[PDB]
Amino acid sequence: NPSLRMKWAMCSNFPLALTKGDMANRIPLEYKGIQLKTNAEDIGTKGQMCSIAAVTWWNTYGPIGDTEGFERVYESFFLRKMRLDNATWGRITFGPSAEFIEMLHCLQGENWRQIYHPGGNKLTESRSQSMIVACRKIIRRSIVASNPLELAVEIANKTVIDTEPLKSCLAAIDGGDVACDIIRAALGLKIRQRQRFGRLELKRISGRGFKNDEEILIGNGTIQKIGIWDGEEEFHVRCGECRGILKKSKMKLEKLLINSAKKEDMRDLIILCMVFSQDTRMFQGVRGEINFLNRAGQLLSPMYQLQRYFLNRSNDLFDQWGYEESPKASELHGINESMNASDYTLKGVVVTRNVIDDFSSTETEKVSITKNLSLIKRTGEVIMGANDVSELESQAQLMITYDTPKMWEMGTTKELVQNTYQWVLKNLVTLKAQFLLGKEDMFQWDAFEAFESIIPQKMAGQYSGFARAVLKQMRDQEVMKTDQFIKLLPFCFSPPKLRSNGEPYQFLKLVLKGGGENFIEVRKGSPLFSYNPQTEVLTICGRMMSLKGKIEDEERNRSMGNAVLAGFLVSGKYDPDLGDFKTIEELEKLKPGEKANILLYQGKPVKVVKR
Amino acid sequence: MDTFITRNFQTTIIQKAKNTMAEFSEDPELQPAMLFNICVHLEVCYVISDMNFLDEEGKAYNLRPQYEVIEGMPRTIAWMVQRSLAQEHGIETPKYLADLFDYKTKRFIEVGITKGLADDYFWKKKEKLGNSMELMIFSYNQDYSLSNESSLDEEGKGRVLSRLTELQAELSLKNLWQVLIGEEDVEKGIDFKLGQTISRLRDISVPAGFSNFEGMRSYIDNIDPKGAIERNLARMSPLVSVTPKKLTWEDLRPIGPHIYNHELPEVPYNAFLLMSDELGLANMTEGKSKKPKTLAKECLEKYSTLRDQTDPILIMKSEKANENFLWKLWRDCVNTISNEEMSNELQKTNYAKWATGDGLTYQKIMKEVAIDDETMCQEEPKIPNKCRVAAWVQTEMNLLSTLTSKRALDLPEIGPDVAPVEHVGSERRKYFVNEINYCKASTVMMKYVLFHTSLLNESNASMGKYKVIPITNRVVNEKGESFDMLYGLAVKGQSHLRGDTDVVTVVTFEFSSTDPRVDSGKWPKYTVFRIGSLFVSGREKSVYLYCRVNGTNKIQMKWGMEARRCLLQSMQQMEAIVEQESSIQGYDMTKACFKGDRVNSPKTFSIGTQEGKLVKGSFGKALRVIFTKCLMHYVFGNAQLEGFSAESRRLLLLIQALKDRKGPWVFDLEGMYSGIEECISNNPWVIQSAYWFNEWLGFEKEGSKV
Amino acid sequence: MNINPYFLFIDVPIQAAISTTFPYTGVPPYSHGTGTGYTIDTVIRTHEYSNKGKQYISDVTGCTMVDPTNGPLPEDNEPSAYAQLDCVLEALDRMDEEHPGLFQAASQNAMETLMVTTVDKLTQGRQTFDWTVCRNQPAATALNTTITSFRLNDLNGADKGGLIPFCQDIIDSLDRPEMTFFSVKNIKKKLPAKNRKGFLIKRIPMKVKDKITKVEYIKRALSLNTMTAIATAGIQIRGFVLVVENLAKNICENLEQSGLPVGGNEKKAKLSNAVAKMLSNCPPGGISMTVTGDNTKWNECLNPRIFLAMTERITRDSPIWFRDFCSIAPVLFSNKIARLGKGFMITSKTKRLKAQIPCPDLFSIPLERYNEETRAKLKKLKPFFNEEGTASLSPGMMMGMFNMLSTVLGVAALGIKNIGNKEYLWDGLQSSDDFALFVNAKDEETCMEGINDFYRTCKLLGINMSKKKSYCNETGMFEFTSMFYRDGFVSNFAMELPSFGVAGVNESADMAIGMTIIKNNMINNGMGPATAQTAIQLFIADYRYTYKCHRGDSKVEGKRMKIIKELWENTKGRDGLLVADGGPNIYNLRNLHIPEIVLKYNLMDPEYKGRLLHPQNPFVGDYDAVSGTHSWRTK
Number of domain units in chain A: 4
User: Cβ(A278)–Cβ(A229) under 8 Å?
Assistant: yes
Q: Does A227 touch chain C (CB under 8 A)?
A: no
A335 in helix, strand or coil? strand
C117 labelled as ligand-binding? no
Residue among B365, B608, B639 minimizing CB distance to C3:
B608
Together in a domain, B225 and B145: no
Q: How far is Cα A165 from Cα A402, in angstroms, rounded to an integer?
A: 10
CB atoms A47 and C635 under 8 Å: yes
Cα dist. B125→B47, B111, B129, B348 in Å? 21, 9, 6, 84
Which of B535, B490, B544, B541 shows the shortest CA–CA distance to B303? B535
What letter would DSSP give residue B132?
A: S
- First-to-last alpha carbon distance for chain C, in angstroms, is 60
Cα–Cα separations (whole angstroms), residue A579 to A190, A582, A598, B59:
75, 8, 10, 117
Q: Are C107 and C247 in contact (CB under 8 A)?
A: yes
C535 contacts on B by Cβ (under 8 Å): 568
Are the C-beta atoms of residues B683 and B638 closer than 8 Å to each other?
A: yes
Distance from CA of C182 to the nearest CA of B (A): 23
The distance of B413 to chain C (nearest Cα, Å) reads 6
CA B432, CA B677: separation in Å to the nearest integer?
Answer: 35
Tell me whether residues B605 and C87 touch, CB distance under 8 A. Answer: no
Is residue B319 located within the same domain as residue B285?
Answer: yes
Closest Cα partner for B333 from B193, B507, B159? Answer: B507
- The reply to whether B637 touches chain C by the CB within 8 Å rule is yes
Domain check: are A157 and A42 in the same one? no
Q: Say if residue B212 is in the same domain as residue B161.
A: no
**Contact flag B284-A581 (C-beta cutoff 8 Å):** yes
Nearest CA in chain C to A63: C611
How far apart CA B459 and CA B473 sit, in angstroms, is 19
In terms of residue numbers, what domain contains A40? 2-61
Residue in chain A lying closest to B412 (CA): A516
Question: Which three-class secondary structure state does DSSP give residue B107?
Answer: strand
Give Cα separations from C43 to C39, C52, C337, C381 (angstroms).
Answer: 6, 16, 10, 8
**Do B650 and B674 contact (CB within 8 A), yes or no?**
no
Tell me how far the alpha carbon of residue B106 is from its chain's centroid. Answer: 57
Q: How many residues are listed for chain A in this entry?
A: 611
Q: Which of A4, A12, A52, A80 to mutate to test the interface with C (most CBs of C within 10 A)?
A: A52
Give the whole-angstrom CA distance, residue A366 versus residue A193. Answer: 9
- Count of Cβ atoms closer than 10 Å to residue B700 Cβ: 18
Choose the final residue of a domain: A61, A77, A111: A61
Nearest-by-Cβ selection for C559 from A53, A59, A63: A53
CB < 8 Å to B587, chain A? 93-94, 292-293
Q: Is A201 on the interface with B (CB under 8 A)?
A: no
The answer to whether residue A560 neighbours chain C at the CB level (below 8 Å) is no
CA distance C75 to C563: 79
Answer yes or no: do A16 and C598 touch at CB < 8 A. Answer: no
Query: Chains with ≥3 Cβ pairs under 8 A against A?
Result: B, C
Q: Which of A307, A313, A386 is nearest to A135 (CA)?
A: A386
Domain match, A370 and A482 both:
no
Instruction: Give the β-pairing of B540-552 and B604-610.
Output: unpaired
Q: Which of C285, C579, C631 is nearest to C444 (CA)?
A: C285
d(CA C179, CA A501): 94
Chain B residue with Cα closest to A586: B537
Q: Which of C113, C531, C554, C590 is the best mutation test for B, with the most CBs of B within 10 A?
A: C531
Chains contacting B (3+ CB pairs below 8 angstroms): A, C
Question: CB of C230 within 8 A of CB of C33?
Answer: yes
* Cβ density class B578-616: b for 16+ within 10 Å, e for less: bbbbbbebbbbbbbbbbeebeebeebebbbbbeeeeebe
CA dihedral B178, B182, B187, B189 (to 10 degrees): -50
Asked if A436 and A547 sit in the same domain, the reply is yes
Inform me whether the C-beta atom of residue A45 falls under 8 Å from chain C C-beta atoms: no
Same domain for B540 and B478: yes
Half-sphere exposure at residue A189, Cβ-oriented, CA atoms within 13 angstroms: 20
Cβ contact C598–A77 (<8 Å): yes
| Strand-by-strand arrangement of the A242-249 sheet | A195-197, A200-207, A233-239, A242-249, A252-258, A349-351
The residue out of A556, A576, A605 marking a domain boundary is A556
Q: What residues contact B499, with CB distance under 8 A and at least 6 apart?
A: none
Question: How many CB atoms are closer than 10 A to CB B85?
Answer: 18
Is B485 domain-assigned? yes
Contact list, C618 vs chain A (CB under 8 Å): 18-19, 21, 23-24, 27, 50
Looking at the structure, tell me whether residues B552 and B454 fall in a common domain. Answer: yes
The answer to whether C232 and C128 have CB atoms below 8 angstroms apart is yes
Helix (H, G, I), strand (E, B) or coil at B325: helix
Radius of gyration of chain A (CA): 33
Distance CA B348, CA B330 (A): 12
C495:B572 CB<8 A: yes
* Pair (A250, A332) in one structural domain: yes
| DSSP SS3 for A388 | helix
Is residue B363 classed exposed, middle or buried when 0-12, 13-18 and 19+ CB atoms within 10 A define those classes? exposed
CA distance B446 to B450: 6
Same domain, A307 and A367: no
In A272-290, which positions are buried (b, 16+ CB within 10 angstroms) versus exposed (e)?
bbbbbbbbebbbebbebeb
Q: Residue A428: inside a domain, yes or no?
A: yes
What are the respective helix, strand and coil percentages of chain A, to the nearest 5?
Answer: 35, 20, 45
Q: Which residues contact C609 (CB under 8 A, 6 or more apart)?
A: A67, C576, C601
Whole-angstrom Cα distance, residue C282 to residue C287? 7
Q: DSSP label at B422?
A: H
| A242 plus A346 within the same structural domain | yes
Alpha-helix residue ranges (DSSP H) falling in C265-319: 265-280, 298-301, 304-314
DSSP bridge partners of C202: none
| Torsion from C-alpha of A116, A120, A122, A124, nearest 10 degrees | 140
Whether residue A519 is contained in a domain is answered as yes
Q: In angstroms, rounded to a whole number, what is the distance separating the alpha carbons of residues C413 and C112?
A: 29
Judgement on whether residues B164 and B50 belong to the same structural domain of the protein: yes
Q: Report chain B residues whose CB lies below 8 A from the CB of A92.
A: 420-421, 424, 588
Contact (CB<8Å) C370/B363:
no
The SS3 of residue A419 is helix
> Do residue B138 and residue B40 come from a single domain?
yes
Are residues B505 and B562 located together in one domain of the fold? Answer: yes
Domain count, chain B: 3
Dihedral pair phi/psi, residue C224, rounded to 5°: -125, 130
Q: What's at A381, amino acid-wise?
A: E
Chain C: touching chains (3 or more CB pairs < 8 Å): A, B
Closest C-alpha among A416, A429, A384 to residue A551: A429
| Identity of the residue in A51, A57, A111 whose CB atom sits nearest the CB atom of C490 | A111
Confirm whether A606 is domain-assigned: no
**In a domain? residue A114:** no
State the nearest Cα–Cα gap between A192 and chain B, in angstroms.
32
Residue pair C94/C415 in contact by the 8 Å Cβ criterion: yes
Domain-located, residue A84: no
Overall resolution, Å = 2.9
Q: What Cα–Cα distance (Å) separates residue C281 from each residue in A61, B661, C261, C437?
A: 72, 22, 26, 15
Same domain? A138 vs A30: no
Alpha carbons C613 and A65: distance in angstroms, whole number = 7
Same structural domain for residues B351 and B443? yes
- Of residues C489, C523, C548, nearest to A105 (C-beta): C523
Answer yes or no: are the C-beta atoms of C582 and C551 closer than 8 Å. yes
Query: What's the per-residue H, E or C state across B226-251?
Result: CCHHHHHHHCCCCCCCCCCEECCCCC
CA–CA dist C530, C520 (Å, integer) = 15
Looking at chain A, which residue has its C-alpha nearest residue B410? A516
Range of the domain at B222: 196-234
Please tell me whether residues B183 and B201 are part of one structural domain: no
Chain A: residue nearest C522 by CA? Answer: A105
Distances (CA, A) of C394 to B340, C44, C410: 69, 12, 21
Per DSSP bridges, beta strands A509-511 and A519-521 are antiparallel
CA distances from A231 to A207, A235, A252, A258 (A): 7, 13, 10, 22
The answer to whether the CB atoms of A60 and C567 lie below 8 A apart is yes
The closest alpha carbon to A106, from A80, A74, A140, belongs to A80
Which residues are registered as beta bridge partners of A606? A598
Q: In this structure, is residue A550 part of a structural domain?
A: yes
Does the residue A239 lie in any domain? yes
Q: Which of A515, A490, A502, A520 is nearest to A566 (CA)?
A: A502
- Residue in C closest to A31 by C-alpha: C563
Does residue B228 fall inside a structural domain? yes
* Closest CA of chain B from A548, distance in Å: 31
Q: What is the DSSP string of A45-82?
A: S--EEE-HHHHHHHHHHS------SHHHHTHHHHHHHH
Strands (E) in C460-595, as ranges, are 471-474, 477-480, 483-486, 489-490
Per the CB < 8 A criterion, the answer to whether B666 and B242 are in contact is no
DSSP category for residue B263: T
- CA dist C208 → A454, B94, B356, C131, C180 (Å): 75, 51, 45, 15, 10
For B100, counting Cβ atoms within 10 Å of its Cβ (0-12 exposed, 13-18 middle, 19+ buried), the class is buried
- For Cα atoms C316, C318, C324, give the angle at the middle one, nearest 5 degrees: 85
Based on the domain organization, do B163 and B201 belong to the same domain? Answer: no
The count of CB pairs under 8 A between chains A and B is 95
Q: Do C528 and B642 touch (CB under 8 A)?
A: no
d(CA B381, CA B378): 9
Contact C630 A55 (CB under 8 A): yes
Q: Give yes or no for a contact between B628 and C8, defined as CB atoms under 8 angstroms apart.
A: no
> Scanning every residue of chain A, which has its alpha carbon at the shortest distance from the alpha carbon of B405?
A585
Q: How far apart are CA A367 and CA A386, in angstroms?
A: 15
CB neighbour list of residue C209: distance below 8 Å, 6 or more residues apart: C152, C180, C181, C182, C183
* A326 part of a folded domain: yes
